[PDB]
């Protein structure tokens, strides 16, 4: 069924954010694997897979709404030179995604697109309870355990 132009635009913005997040998490996971932080690499790989799943859901919604997805568009990438900076950059990007998701949910509610609102609410739940929560936990553990102990935990068994 035909969708609103505003709904399509906010969905395309969310898709651009999700694709950029997936690419950033991909590079971060690979640089963590390169550095030997196996458990961090596994977690960030799973998070990247979740990001691809969310992007797929967004593209399905966009096509269902008879819109054209903007997959060529990519946002700026903030790549960290070490694990604390990587965690901070991922957390900041996920926070911006959270704000954009909340704005899009409000727009969908105003535009009477309740199915899109349900999809975006599920995405916001995933971003807040799985992604943002884990990253904030990681920064807290970096500050509590210390960088050396946190990196020892991140490396895992060798």
């Amino acid at each position: 069924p035909r969708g609103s132009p505003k709904v399509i635009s906010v969905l395309n913005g969310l898709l651009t954010g999700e694709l950029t997040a997936a690419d950033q998490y991909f590079v971060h996971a690979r640089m963590l694997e390169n550095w030997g932080f196996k458990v961090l690499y596994e977690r960030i790989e799973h998070e990247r897979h979740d990001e691809l799943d969310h992007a797929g859901l967004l593209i399905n919604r966009i096509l269902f709404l008879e819109g054209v997805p903007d997959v060529a568009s990519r946002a700026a990438l903030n790549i960290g030179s070490d694990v604390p900076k990587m965690m901070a950059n991922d957390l900041a990007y996920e926070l911006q995604v959270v704000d954009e998701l909340k704005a899009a949910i409000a727009l969908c509610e105003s535009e009477r697109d309740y199915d899109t609102r349900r999809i975006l609410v599920h995405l916001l739940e995933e971003t807040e309870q799985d992604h943002v929560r884990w990253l904030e936990v990681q920064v807290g553990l970096i500050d509590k355990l210390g960088l050396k102990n946190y990196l020892q935990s991140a490396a895992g068994e060798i």
Binding site: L141, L145, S153
Partner: protein, 154 residues
């Protein structure tokens, strides 16, 4: 008996306070990512809930009215060492009361209540042993090492 029922009510008030404090501490431990310590605190919370269940059934056996309204002061810490020390503190301050209650139950020839409270005392003393051990481990291996062990699997 009136005195025995009042003492059991006070012990139950302790038990409910301990349940709430244990569960809150476990929840903020999970929030901070201390999965192993959070899991153990959740288990100790659940054990306290089972003990309070036993106590409420015992009070209803004695034709009394269990008091699930009163709660003691909750000692909530801002960090893991403060949680451990607060938990051990409440366990000790209530262990003394449990010992006095067991003495009273022995006085009044109430022996099933005495047996239940002796089991509660054994579990409580294991808990104090665990928490004193945790504080000494924090002293020995260090704060950061203990926090890393509390996190467990990243």
């Amino acid at each position: 008996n009136r005195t025995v029922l009042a003492a059991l009510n006070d012990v139950l008030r302790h038990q409910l306070t301990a349940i709430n404090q244990y569960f809150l501490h476990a929840r903020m431990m999970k929030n901070w990512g201390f999965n192993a310590l959070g899991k153990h605190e959740y288990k100790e919370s659940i054990e306290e809930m089972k003990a309070a269940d036993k106590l409420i059934e015992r009070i209803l056996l004695l034709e009394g009215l269990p008091n699930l309204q009163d709660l003691g002061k909750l000692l909530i810490g801002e960090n893991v060492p403060e949680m451990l020390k607060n938990d051990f503190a409440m366990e000790k301050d209530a262990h003394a009361d449990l010992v006095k209650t067991i003495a009273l139950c022995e006085k009044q020839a109430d022996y099933v209540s005495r047996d239940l409270l002796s089991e509660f005392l054994e579990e409580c003393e294991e808990r104090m042993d665990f928490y004193e051990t945790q504080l000494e481990l924090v002293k020995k291996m260090g704060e950061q090492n203990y926090l890393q062990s509390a996190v467990g699997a990243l």
